[PDB]
PDB file of C-alpha atoms in Angstrom:
ATOM      1  CA  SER A   1       0.000   0.000   0.000  1.00 31.15           C
ATOM      2  CA  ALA A   2       3.105   2.168   0.309  1.00 30.88           C
ATOM      3  CA  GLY A   3       2.486   4.214  -2.828  1.00 31.54           C
ATOM      4  CA  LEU A   4       0.404   7.323  -3.473  1.00 28.62           C
ATOM      5  CA  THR A   5       2.601  10.055  -4.955  1.00 30.19           C
ATOM      6  CA  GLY A   6       0.676  12.619  -6.997  1.00 32.39           C
ATOM      7  CA  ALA A   7      -2.116  11.682  -9.403  1.00 35.14           C
ATOM      8  CA  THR A   8       0.026   8.776 -10.582  1.00 34.02           C
ATOM      9  CA  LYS A   9      -1.757   6.479  -8.157  1.00 32.76           C
ATOM     10  CA  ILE A  10      -5.303   7.346  -9.204  1.00 33.46           C
ATOM     11  CA  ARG A  11      -4.071   7.378 -12.791  1.00 34.14           C
ATOM     12  CA  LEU A  12      -3.020   3.734 -12.599  1.00 34.21           C
ATOM     13  CA  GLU A  13      -6.216   2.781 -10.815  1.00 32.20           C
ATOM     14  CA  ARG A  14      -8.489   4.068 -13.572  1.00 29.65           C
ATOM     15  CA  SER A  15      -6.136   2.837 -16.291  1.00 28.24           C
ATOM     16  CA  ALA A  16      -6.120  -0.566 -14.597  1.00 24.90           C
ATOM     17  CA  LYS A  17      -9.903  -0.907 -14.593  1.00 21.06           C
ATOM     18  CA  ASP A  18      -9.955  -0.478 -18.358  1.00 21.24           C
ATOM     19  CA  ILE A  19      -7.948  -3.675 -18.499  1.00 22.36           C
ATOM     20  CA  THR A  20     -10.609  -6.028 -17.221  1.00 21.68           C
ATOM     21  CA  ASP A  21     -13.505  -3.868 -18.356  1.00 23.86           C
ATOM     22  CA  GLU A  22     -12.322  -3.942 -21.949  1.00 28.67           C
ATOM     23  CA  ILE A  23     -11.515  -7.624 -22.322  1.00 27.43           C
ATOM     24  CA  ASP A  24     -14.720  -8.327 -20.440  1.00 27.61           C
ATOM     25  CA  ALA A  25     -16.800  -6.693 -23.169  1.00 28.76           C
ATOM     26  CA  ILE A  26     -15.630  -9.580 -25.349  1.00 28.53           C
ATOM     27  CA  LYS A  27     -17.417 -12.149 -23.190  1.00 28.73           C
ATOM     28  CA  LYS A  28     -20.587 -10.064 -23.411  1.00 30.62           C
ATOM     29  CA  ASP A  29     -20.361  -9.837 -27.200  1.00 35.05           C
ATOM     30  CA  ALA A  30     -19.612 -13.557 -27.418  1.00 36.31           C
ATOM     31  CA  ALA A  31     -22.923 -14.226 -25.680  1.00 33.06           C
ATOM     32  CA  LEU A  32     -24.747 -12.998 -28.777  1.00 35.93           C
ATOM     33  CA  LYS A  33     -23.351 -15.886 -30.817  1.00 35.33           C
ATOM     34  CA  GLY A  34     -23.060 -19.456 -29.558  1.00 33.63           C
ATOM     35  CA  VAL A  35     -19.303 -19.955 -29.247  1.00 35.08           C
ATOM     36  CA  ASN A  36     -17.237 -22.322 -27.111  1.00 36.32           C
ATOM     37  CA  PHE A  37     -14.787 -19.551 -26.225  1.00 31.53           C
ATOM     38  CA  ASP A  38     -11.996 -21.702 -24.799  1.00 28.29           C
ATOM     39  CA  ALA A  39     -10.584 -24.819 -26.458  1.00 24.44           C
ATOM     40  CA  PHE A  40      -7.458 -24.098 -24.421  1.00 24.06           C
ATOM     41  CA  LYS A  41      -7.226 -27.793 -23.574  1.00 25.77           C
ATOM     42  CA  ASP A  42      -3.614 -28.934 -23.884  1.00 22.75           C
ATOM     43  CA  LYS A  43      -2.909 -27.381 -27.287  1.00 22.80           C
ATOM     44  CA  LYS A  44      -5.183 -25.929 -29.962  1.00 24.16           C
ATOM     45  CA  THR A  45      -4.847 -26.931 -33.614  1.00 21.00           C
ATOM     46  CA  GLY A  46      -6.344 -25.288 -36.700  1.00 24.18           C
ATOM     47  CA  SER A  47      -4.903 -21.773 -36.808  1.00 28.60           C
ATOM     48  CA  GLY A  48      -8.023 -19.711 -37.497  1.00 27.64           C
ATOM     49  CA  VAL A  49      -9.359 -22.449 -39.770  1.00 29.84           C
ATOM     50  CA  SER A  50     -12.010 -24.543 -38.029  1.00 26.08           C
ATOM     51  CA  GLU A  51     -10.973 -23.080 -34.694  1.00 24.22           C
ATOM     52  CA  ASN A  52     -13.469 -20.216 -34.460  1.00 23.91           C
ATOM     53  CA  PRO A  53     -10.996 -17.363 -35.205  1.00 27.83           C
ATOM     54  CA  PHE A  54     -12.946 -15.588 -32.472  1.00 27.60           C
ATOM     55  CA  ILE A  55     -10.548 -16.678 -29.738  1.00 24.36           C
ATOM     56  CA  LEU A  56      -7.415 -16.126 -31.816  1.00 26.43           C
ATOM     57  CA  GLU A  57      -8.576 -12.729 -33.043  1.00 26.52           C
ATOM     58  CA  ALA A  58      -9.890 -11.918 -29.572  1.00 28.07           C
ATOM     59  CA  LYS A  59      -6.533 -12.770 -28.011  1.00 26.06           C
ATOM     60  CA  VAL A  60      -5.366  -9.687 -29.897  1.00 25.87           C
ATOM     61  CA  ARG A  61      -8.045  -7.240 -28.756  1.00 27.30           C
ATOM     62  CA  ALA A  62      -7.592  -8.503 -25.205  1.00 25.26           C
ATOM     63  CA  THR A  63      -3.835  -7.919 -25.136  1.00 24.75           C
ATOM     64  CA  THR A  64      -4.375  -4.651 -26.965  1.00 25.20           C
ATOM     65  CA  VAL A  65      -5.393  -2.718 -23.863  1.00 23.74           C
ATOM     66  CA  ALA A  66      -2.993  -4.636 -21.634  1.00 24.23           C
ATOM     67  CA  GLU A  67      -0.100  -3.729 -23.906  1.00 21.89           C
ATOM     68  CA  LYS A  68      -0.499  -0.025 -23.202  1.00 21.00           C
ATOM     69  CA  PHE A  69      -0.438  -0.895 -19.519  1.00 23.51           C
ATOM     70  CA  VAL A  70       3.079  -2.291 -19.793  1.00 24.99           C
ATOM     71  CA  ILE A  71       4.380   0.952 -21.269  1.00 24.82           C
ATOM     72  CA  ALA A  72       2.983   2.722 -18.209  1.00 24.72           C
ATOM     73  CA  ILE A  73       5.473   0.849 -16.048  1.00 24.85           C
ATOM     74  CA  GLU A  74       8.365   1.802 -18.293  1.00 24.57           C
ATOM     75  CA  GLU A  75       7.396   5.471 -18.377  1.00 23.06           C
ATOM     76  CA  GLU A  76       6.509   5.429 -14.685  1.00 22.76           C
ATOM     77  CA  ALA A  77       9.850   3.809 -13.881  1.00 20.26           C
ATOM     78  CA  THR A  78      11.624   6.945 -15.079  1.00 19.19           C
ATOM     79  CA  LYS A  79       9.546   9.192 -12.826  1.00 22.15           C
ATOM     80  CA  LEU A  80       9.668   6.559 -10.096  1.00 22.98           C
ATOM     81  CA  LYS A  81      13.472   6.726 -10.026  1.00 22.59           C
ATOM     82  CA  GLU A  82      13.029   9.028  -7.032  1.00 25.70           C
ATOM     83  CA  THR A  83      12.774   7.445  -3.590  1.00 26.04           C
ATOM     84  CA  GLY A  84      13.456   3.983  -5.005  1.00 25.19           C
ATOM     85  CA  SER A  85      13.763   1.104  -2.545  1.00 27.78           C
ATOM     86  CA  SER A  86      12.472  -2.378  -3.345  1.00 27.27           C
ATOM     87  CA  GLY A  87       9.384  -1.408  -1.366  1.00 23.31           C
ATOM     88  CA  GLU A  88       8.297   1.138  -3.966  1.00 24.12           C
ATOM     89  CA  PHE A  89       9.269  -1.051  -6.916  1.00 22.50           C
ATOM     90  CA  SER A  90       7.519  -4.025  -5.329  1.00 21.35           C
ATOM     91  CA  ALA A  91       4.280  -2.096  -5.827  1.00 20.03           C
ATOM     92  CA  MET A  92       5.015  -2.045  -9.560  1.00 21.46           C
ATOM     93  CA  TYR A  93       5.500  -5.804  -9.818  1.00 21.48           C
ATOM     94  CA  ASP A  94       2.216  -6.346  -7.972  1.00 20.70           C
ATOM     95  CA  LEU A  95       0.286  -4.670 -10.782  1.00 21.19           C
ATOM     96  CA  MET A  96       1.874  -7.105 -13.201  1.00 25.45           C
ATOM     97  CA  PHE A  97       0.788 -10.195 -11.277  1.00 22.92           C
ATOM     98  CA  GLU A  98      -2.656  -8.785 -10.543  1.00 21.66           C
ATOM     99  CA  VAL A  99      -3.116  -8.088 -14.240  1.00 22.58           C
ATOM    100  CA  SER A 100      -1.462 -11.365 -15.189  1.00 22.58           C
ATOM    101  CA  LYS A 101      -4.287 -13.256 -13.486  1.00 21.37           C
ATOM    102  CA  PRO A 102      -7.238 -11.899 -15.520  1.00 23.33           C
ATOM    103  CA  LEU A 103      -5.339 -12.598 -18.736  1.00 26.49           C
ATOM    104  CA  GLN A 104      -4.537 -16.049 -17.446  1.00 25.28           C
ATOM    105  CA  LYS A 105      -8.144 -17.226 -17.640  1.00 22.34           C
ATOM    106  CA  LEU A 106      -8.234 -16.240 -21.300  1.00 19.73           C
ATOM    107  CA  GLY A 107      -4.884 -17.924 -21.984  1.00 21.49           C
ATOM    108  CA  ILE A 108      -2.109 -15.738 -23.384  1.00 21.02           C
ATOM    109  CA  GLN A 109       1.333 -17.117 -22.609  1.00 21.21           C
ATOM    110  CA  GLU A 110       3.745 -18.115 -19.847  1.00 19.13           C
ATOM    111  CA  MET A 111       3.887 -14.516 -18.641  1.00 21.97           C
ATOM    112  CA  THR A 112       3.393 -15.262 -14.954  1.00 22.46           C
ATOM    113  CA  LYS A 113       6.420 -17.504 -15.444  1.00 23.59           C
ATOM    114  CA  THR A 114       8.451 -15.330 -17.802  1.00 22.05           C
ATOM    115  CA  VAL A 115       8.072 -12.300 -15.568  1.00 21.04           C
ATOM    116  CA  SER A 116       9.006 -14.290 -12.467  1.00 23.41           C
ATOM    117  CA  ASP A 117      11.762 -16.149 -14.298  1.00 25.03           C
ATOM    118  CA  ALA A 118      13.401 -12.798 -15.002  1.00 25.35           C
ATOM    119  CA  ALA A 119      13.555 -12.069 -11.281  1.00 24.32           C
ATOM    120  CA  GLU A 120      16.310 -14.655 -10.959  1.00 24.78           C
ATOM    121  CA  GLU A 121      18.324 -13.162 -13.800  1.00 28.23           C
ATOM    122  CA  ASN A 122      18.307  -9.663 -12.306  1.00 28.05           C
ATOM    123  CA  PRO A 123      16.247  -9.359  -9.074  1.00 25.83           C
ATOM    124  CA  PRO A 124      14.626  -5.896  -9.475  1.00 25.14           C
ATOM    125  CA  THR A 125      16.488  -3.878  -6.844  1.00 25.73           C
ATOM    126  CA  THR A 126      16.792  -0.586  -8.716  1.00 26.24           C
ATOM    127  CA  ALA A 127      14.855   1.528 -11.206  1.00 27.15           C
ATOM    128  CA  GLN A 128      17.016   0.172 -14.024  1.00 24.87           C
ATOM    129  CA  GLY A 129      16.158  -3.330 -12.839  1.00 26.50           C
ATOM    130  CA  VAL A 130      12.459  -2.859 -13.575  1.00 25.71           C
ATOM    131  CA  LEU A 131      13.279  -1.546 -17.035  1.00 27.35           C
ATOM    132  CA  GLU A 132      14.542  -5.000 -17.920  1.00 26.74           C
ATOM    133  CA  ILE A 133      11.248  -6.679 -17.070  1.00 27.15           C
ATOM    134  CA  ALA A 134       9.294  -3.870 -18.725  1.00 26.00           C
ATOM    135  CA  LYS A 135      11.046  -4.508 -22.039  1.00 24.36           C
ATOM    136  CA  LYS A 136      10.522  -8.242 -21.581  1.00 20.28           C
ATOM    137  CA  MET A 137       6.851  -7.590 -20.974  1.00 21.40           C
ATOM    138  CA  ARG A 138       6.141  -5.341 -23.928  1.00 22.70           C
ATOM    139  CA  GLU A 139       8.298  -7.439 -26.218  1.00 23.92           C
ATOM    140  CA  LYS A 140       6.832 -10.812 -25.331  1.00 19.60           C
ATOM    141  CA  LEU A 141       3.336  -9.585 -24.587  1.00 20.04           C
ATOM    142  CA  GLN A 142       3.315  -8.149 -28.090  1.00 19.93           C
ATOM    143  CA  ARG A 143       4.239 -11.566 -29.460  1.00 19.45           C
ATOM    144  CA  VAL A 144       0.592 -12.441 -28.843  1.00 21.67           C
ATOM    145  CA  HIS A 145      -0.466 -10.242 -31.758  1.00 22.56           C
ATOM    146  CA  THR A 146       2.434 -11.538 -33.831  1.00 19.48           C
ATOM    147  CA  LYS A 147       1.156 -15.108 -33.920  1.00 14.54           C
ATOM    148  CA  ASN A 148      -2.412 -14.037 -34.637  1.00 16.38           C
ATOM    149  CA  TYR A 149      -1.228 -11.539 -37.234  1.00 13.98           C
ATOM    150  CA  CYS A 150       1.086 -14.054 -38.882  1.00 16.10           C
ATOM    151  CA  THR A 151      -1.250 -17.026 -38.611  1.00 16.73           C
ATOM    152  CA  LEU A 152      -4.087 -15.152 -40.267  1.00 17.22           C
ATOM    153  CA  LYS A 153      -1.729 -14.120 -43.037  1.00 16.86           C
ATOM    154  CA  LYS A 154      -1.788 -17.788 -43.994  1.00 17.78           C
ATOM    155  CA  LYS A 155      -4.668 -16.963 -46.321  1.00 19.22           C
ATOM    156  CA  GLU A 156      -2.580 -14.507 -48.312  1.00 21.94           C
ATOM    157  CA  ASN A 157       0.496 -16.741 -48.236  1.00 20.31           C
ATOM    158  CA  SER A 158      -1.563 -19.786 -49.207  1.00 20.85           C
ATOM    159  CA  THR A 159       1.209 -21.831 -50.813  1.00 22.72           C
ATOM    160  CA  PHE A 160       4.801 -20.730 -50.207  1.00 21.58           C
ATOM    161  CA  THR A 161       6.088 -23.722 -48.254  1.00 20.22           C
ATOM    162  CA  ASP A 162       8.804 -21.445 -46.869  1.00 19.13           C
ATOM    163  CA  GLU A 163       7.664 -18.634 -44.566  1.00 22.50           C
ATOM    164  CA  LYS A 164       9.733 -18.127 -41.426  1.00 21.62           C
ATOM    165  CA  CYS A 165       7.592 -15.107 -40.573  1.00 23.16           C
ATOM    166  CA  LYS A 166      10.209 -12.973 -38.822  1.00 24.05           C
ATOM    167  CA  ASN A 167       9.320  -9.282 -39.051  1.00 28.57           C
ATOM    168  CA  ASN A 168      11.010  -8.666 -35.699  1.00 27.12           C
TER     169      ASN A 168
END
Protein backbone atom coordinates (compact mmCIF):
# COMPACT_ATOMS: atom_id res chain seq x y z
CA SER A 1 0.00 0.00 0.00
CA ALA A 2 3.11 2.17 0.31
CA GLY A 3 2.49 4.21 -2.83
CA LEU A 4 0.40 7.32 -3.47
CA THR A 5 2.60 10.05 -4.96
CA GLY A 6 0.68 12.62 -7.00
CA ALA A 7 -2.12 11.68 -9.40
CA THR A 8 0.03 8.78 -10.58
CA LYS A 9 -1.76 6.48 -8.16
CA ILE A 10 -5.30 7.35 -9.20
CA ARG A 11 -4.07 7.38 -12.79
CA LEU A 12 -3.02 3.73 -12.60
CA GLU A 13 -6.22 2.78 -10.82
CA ARG A 14 -8.49 4.07 -13.57
CA SER A 15 -6.14 2.84 -16.29
CA ALA A 16 -6.12 -0.57 -14.60
CA LYS A 17 -9.90 -0.91 -14.59
CA ASP A 18 -9.96 -0.48 -18.36
CA ILE A 19 -7.95 -3.67 -18.50
CA THR A 20 -10.61 -6.03 -17.22
CA ASP A 21 -13.50 -3.87 -18.36
CA GLU A 22 -12.32 -3.94 -21.95
CA ILE A 23 -11.52 -7.62 -22.32
CA ASP A 24 -14.72 -8.33 -20.44
CA ALA A 25 -16.80 -6.69 -23.17
CA ILE A 26 -15.63 -9.58 -25.35
CA LYS A 27 -17.42 -12.15 -23.19
CA LYS A 28 -20.59 -10.06 -23.41
CA ASP A 29 -20.36 -9.84 -27.20
CA ALA A 30 -19.61 -13.56 -27.42
CA ALA A 31 -22.92 -14.23 -25.68
CA LEU A 32 -24.75 -13.00 -28.78
CA LYS A 33 -23.35 -15.89 -30.82
CA GLY A 34 -23.06 -19.46 -29.56
CA VAL A 35 -19.30 -19.96 -29.25
CA ASN A 36 -17.24 -22.32 -27.11
CA PHE A 37 -14.79 -19.55 -26.22
CA ASP A 38 -12.00 -21.70 -24.80
CA ALA A 39 -10.58 -24.82 -26.46
CA PHE A 40 -7.46 -24.10 -24.42
CA LYS A 41 -7.23 -27.79 -23.57
CA ASP A 42 -3.61 -28.93 -23.88
CA LYS A 43 -2.91 -27.38 -27.29
CA LYS A 44 -5.18 -25.93 -29.96
CA THR A 45 -4.85 -26.93 -33.61
CA GLY A 46 -6.34 -25.29 -36.70
CA SER A 47 -4.90 -21.77 -36.81
CA GLY A 48 -8.02 -19.71 -37.50
CA VAL A 49 -9.36 -22.45 -39.77
CA SER A 50 -12.01 -24.54 -38.03
CA GLU A 51 -10.97 -23.08 -34.69
CA ASN A 52 -13.47 -20.22 -34.46
CA PRO A 53 -11.00 -17.36 -35.21
CA PHE A 54 -12.95 -15.59 -32.47
CA ILE A 55 -10.55 -16.68 -29.74
CA LEU A 56 -7.41 -16.13 -31.82
CA GLU A 57 -8.58 -12.73 -33.04
CA ALA A 58 -9.89 -11.92 -29.57
CA LYS A 59 -6.53 -12.77 -28.01
CA VAL A 60 -5.37 -9.69 -29.90
CA ARG A 61 -8.05 -7.24 -28.76
CA ALA A 62 -7.59 -8.50 -25.20
CA THR A 63 -3.84 -7.92 -25.14
CA THR A 64 -4.37 -4.65 -26.96
CA VAL A 65 -5.39 -2.72 -23.86
CA ALA A 66 -2.99 -4.64 -21.63
CA GLU A 67 -0.10 -3.73 -23.91
CA LYS A 68 -0.50 -0.02 -23.20
CA PHE A 69 -0.44 -0.89 -19.52
CA VAL A 70 3.08 -2.29 -19.79
CA ILE A 71 4.38 0.95 -21.27
CA ALA A 72 2.98 2.72 -18.21
CA ILE A 73 5.47 0.85 -16.05
CA GLU A 74 8.37 1.80 -18.29
CA GLU A 75 7.40 5.47 -18.38
CA GLU A 76 6.51 5.43 -14.69
CA ALA A 77 9.85 3.81 -13.88
CA THR A 78 11.62 6.95 -15.08
CA LYS A 79 9.55 9.19 -12.83
CA LEU A 80 9.67 6.56 -10.10
CA LYS A 81 13.47 6.73 -10.03
CA GLU A 82 13.03 9.03 -7.03
CA THR A 83 12.77 7.45 -3.59
CA GLY A 84 13.46 3.98 -5.01
CA SER A 85 13.76 1.10 -2.54
CA SER A 86 12.47 -2.38 -3.34
CA GLY A 87 9.38 -1.41 -1.37
CA GLU A 88 8.30 1.14 -3.97
CA PHE A 89 9.27 -1.05 -6.92
CA SER A 90 7.52 -4.02 -5.33
CA ALA A 91 4.28 -2.10 -5.83
CA MET A 92 5.02 -2.05 -9.56
CA TYR A 93 5.50 -5.80 -9.82
CA ASP A 94 2.22 -6.35 -7.97
CA LEU A 95 0.29 -4.67 -10.78
CA MET A 96 1.87 -7.11 -13.20
CA PHE A 97 0.79 -10.19 -11.28
CA GLU A 98 -2.66 -8.78 -10.54
CA VAL A 99 -3.12 -8.09 -14.24
CA SER A 100 -1.46 -11.36 -15.19
CA LYS A 101 -4.29 -13.26 -13.49
CA PRO A 102 -7.24 -11.90 -15.52
CA LEU A 103 -5.34 -12.60 -18.74
CA GLN A 104 -4.54 -16.05 -17.45
CA LYS A 105 -8.14 -17.23 -17.64
CA LEU A 106 -8.23 -16.24 -21.30
CA GLY A 107 -4.88 -17.92 -21.98
CA ILE A 108 -2.11 -15.74 -23.38
CA GLN A 109 1.33 -17.12 -22.61
CA GLU A 110 3.75 -18.12 -19.85
CA MET A 111 3.89 -14.52 -18.64
CA THR A 112 3.39 -15.26 -14.95
CA LYS A 113 6.42 -17.50 -15.44
CA THR A 114 8.45 -15.33 -17.80
CA VAL A 115 8.07 -12.30 -15.57
CA SER A 116 9.01 -14.29 -12.47
CA ASP A 117 11.76 -16.15 -14.30
CA ALA A 118 13.40 -12.80 -15.00
CA ALA A 119 13.56 -12.07 -11.28
CA GLU A 120 16.31 -14.65 -10.96
CA GLU A 121 18.32 -13.16 -13.80
CA ASN A 122 18.31 -9.66 -12.31
CA PRO A 123 16.25 -9.36 -9.07
CA PRO A 124 14.63 -5.90 -9.48
CA THR A 125 16.49 -3.88 -6.84
CA THR A 126 16.79 -0.59 -8.72
CA ALA A 127 14.85 1.53 -11.21
CA GLN A 128 17.02 0.17 -14.02
CA GLY A 129 16.16 -3.33 -12.84
CA VAL A 130 12.46 -2.86 -13.58
CA LEU A 131 13.28 -1.55 -17.03
CA GLU A 132 14.54 -5.00 -17.92
CA ILE A 133 11.25 -6.68 -17.07
CA ALA A 134 9.29 -3.87 -18.73
CA LYS A 135 11.05 -4.51 -22.04
CA LYS A 136 10.52 -8.24 -21.58
CA MET A 137 6.85 -7.59 -20.97
CA ARG A 138 6.14 -5.34 -23.93
CA GLU A 139 8.30 -7.44 -26.22
CA LYS A 140 6.83 -10.81 -25.33
CA LEU A 141 3.34 -9.59 -24.59
CA GLN A 142 3.32 -8.15 -28.09
CA ARG A 143 4.24 -11.57 -29.46
CA VAL A 144 0.59 -12.44 -28.84
CA HIS A 145 -0.47 -10.24 -31.76
CA THR A 146 2.43 -11.54 -33.83
CA LYS A 147 1.16 -15.11 -33.92
CA ASN A 148 -2.41 -14.04 -34.64
CA TYR A 149 -1.23 -11.54 -37.23
CA CYS A 150 1.09 -14.05 -38.88
CA THR A 151 -1.25 -17.03 -38.61
CA LEU A 152 -4.09 -15.15 -40.27
CA LYS A 153 -1.73 -14.12 -43.04
CA LYS A 154 -1.79 -17.79 -43.99
CA LYS A 155 -4.67 -16.96 -46.32
CA GLU A 156 -2.58 -14.51 -48.31
CA ASN A 157 0.50 -16.74 -48.24
CA SER A 158 -1.56 -19.79 -49.21
CA THR A 159 1.21 -21.83 -50.81
CA PHE A 160 4.80 -20.73 -50.21
CA THR A 161 6.09 -23.72 -48.25
CA ASP A 162 8.80 -21.45 -46.87
CA GLU A 163 7.66 -18.63 -44.57
CA LYS A 164 9.73 -18.13 -41.43
CA CYS A 165 7.59 -15.11 -40.57
CA LYS A 166 10.21 -12.97 -38.82
CA ASN A 167 9.32 -9.28 -39.05
CA ASN A 168 11.01 -8.67 -35.70
